[PDB]
Amino acid sequence: MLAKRIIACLDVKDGRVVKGSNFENLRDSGDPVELGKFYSEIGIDELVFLDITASVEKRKTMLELVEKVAEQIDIPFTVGGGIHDFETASELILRGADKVSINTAAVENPSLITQIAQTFGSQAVVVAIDAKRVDGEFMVFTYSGKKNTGILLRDWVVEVEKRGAGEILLTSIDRDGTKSGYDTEMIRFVRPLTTLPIIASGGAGKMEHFLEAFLAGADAALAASVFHFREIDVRELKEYLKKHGVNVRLEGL
Amino acid sequence: MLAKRIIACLDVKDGRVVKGSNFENLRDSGDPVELGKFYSEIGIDELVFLDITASVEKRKTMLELVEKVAEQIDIPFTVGGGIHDFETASELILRGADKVSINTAAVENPSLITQIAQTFGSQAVVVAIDAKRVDGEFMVFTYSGKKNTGILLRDWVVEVEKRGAGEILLTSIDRDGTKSGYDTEMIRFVRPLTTLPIIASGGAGKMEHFLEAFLAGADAALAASVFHFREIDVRELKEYLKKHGVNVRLEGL
């Protein structure tokens, strides 16, 4: 059966991971190399480095981050946040990013998905879809949740798979950072519309929330707050999930 | 008694208002001058021009927008989105913006609020506060809702008034664009903590939602989706609000 993955989202600003969360067991929790390697050693399956400014000095600072992280970490990582074109995506993958996450650029040029997939393989392209329920209908939002595109989530999911994406990173903006639980209604809604791996994102607060995300059909669970604020232990989480029948990897823990 | 204002939020990209909403009655609904003047003529009290990229070419494209809008519109306007420092804010106000909205830059340097207020007057400084309920506690989020700062909304509201802000633009990220109603719990929570005008933002979907926002203590109601998608008529809205005792301005309608 398909593996169920636990993925940590590391928010980046100026090529360093946003700090303030006291990793007294580490020399510098702002260093993408040290922090990424740490997660690799305690059981995280993959990482996402999300540039949350995704603006100034971004392109160059993210390239340097990729160069350093790629030579030191042994689990897959995705880079996202403001990747606006094929050349930017190509530069990141060429330097060692395993995958790139595109969102607004994919909505504005759907064949960008296919271009990256044809050159680097479908597994290198993650389409991040940010959605909200608008008067009872799931809609796709771009520009960091500030633009309702008018495109129904149902239609965009189907199109993204047709364009050759490898995976969908499905974020519920309205649950993101709330610690109130993943948006399992949204995950269940998307599950029958695609065969691709679905990475659920936004809302994790406790171990049981991960179980619900996987029972709703997620293939991976991404979280930022619970790992950044050290609210959930990775090994504890994986042991709980495996006890409840979820196919997480316990090897190396 | 204090006036209750209706404010339209115009999302900007590359110095033009995001289109796709068919204003067949206008020559070009993407033009900030034509669209801003239109709203001015049909009863909108103020405008907000929000750069939703707020990144590349932004500083220069927003300066040009301000120069053109300031000479043609006769209602106040605020400019927001990625204003990172005092010089940027100063340039915008000097060219004709009535107010500037600062958010992440204010959280990272609270005396920026005071600097703008001392030079241009407190009425020129709007502090945009984006918040979410995190495990039952309202927290302040920066970087387009991607960073939980760990600062309680209660404490930041009090600090913003102490620093000399003129107004608070209070956005509930989790209701923004949903058309499900303003976050009246959040508005009620903030009302007793500040004497400043509160501009409620995020969630408007129907006329009754505006009434609820004002009954919760808002001094102004900001909306993007209902005006952008032409879902609510401004004069109809104001007549309904005045019938329900809300002190909106009917002059000129």
Instruction: Write down the domain spans for chain B.
Output: 1-253
User: What is the Cα–Cα distance from A34 to A73, expressed in whole angstroms?
Assistant: 9
Task: Count CB pairs under 8 A between chains A and B.
Answer: 87
CB A106 within 8 A of CB A98: no
Kindly determine whether residue A205 and residue B135, on different chains, have CB atoms separated by under 8 Å: yes
Task: Find the residue in A nearest to B202 (Cα).
Answer: A146
> In the PDB record, what is the listed experimental method?
X-ray
What is the Cβ-side half-sphere exposure of residue B184, based on CA atoms within 13 angstroms?
13
Q: Does B231 touch chain A (CB under 8 A)?
A: no
Q: Does A14 touch chain B (CB under 8 A)?
A: no
For B143-231, where are the E strands, in sequence order? 147-152, 167-172, 198-201, 220-223
Kindly determine whether residue A145 and residue B176, on different chains, have CB atoms separated by under 8 Å: yes
Cα–Cα separations (whole angstroms), residue A89 to A7, A64, A101, A126:
21, 14, 9, 11
CB atoms within 10 A of CB A114: 16
User: What is the Cα–Cα distance from A186 to A141, expressed in whole angstroms?
Assistant: 14
| Residue B173 Ramachandran class (φ > 0 left, ψ -120 to 50 alpha, else beta) | alpha
User: What is the Cα–Cα distance from B12 to B52, expressed in whole angstroms?
Assistant: 6
Breaks in chain A after (C-N > 2.5 angstroms) = none
CATH class entry, domain A1-253: alpha beta
Q: Does A136 touch chain B (CB under 8 A)?
A: no
User: What is the Cα–Cα distance from B156 to A211, expressed in whole angstroms?
Assistant: 35
Q: Which amino acid is at A151?
A: I
Nearest-Cα distance to chain B for A251, in Å, is 32
CB B132 within 8 A of CB B162: no
Cα–Cα separations (whole angstroms), residue A233 to A59, A143, A206, A248:
33, 32, 10, 15
B134-158 CB burial, b ≥16 within 10 A, e <16: beeebbbbbbbbbbbbebebbebbe
Q: Does B247 touch chain A (CB under 8 A)?
A: no
Helix axes B234-243 and B207-215, enclosed angle (nearest 10)? 40
User: What is the Cα–Cα distance from B203 to B181, expressed in whole angstroms?
Assistant: 5
At which residue do the structure tokens 């090529």 appear? Answer: A15
CB B179 within 8 A of CB B225: yes
Please say if A219 is a catalytic residue.
Answer: no
At which residue do the structure tokens 């994986």 appear? Answer: A238
Q: Which of B98, B130, B183, B219 is catalytic?
A: B130
User: What is the Cα–Cα distance from B244 to B214, expressed in whole angstroms?
Assistant: 10
Resolution (A): 1.5
Three-state DSSP state, A116: helix
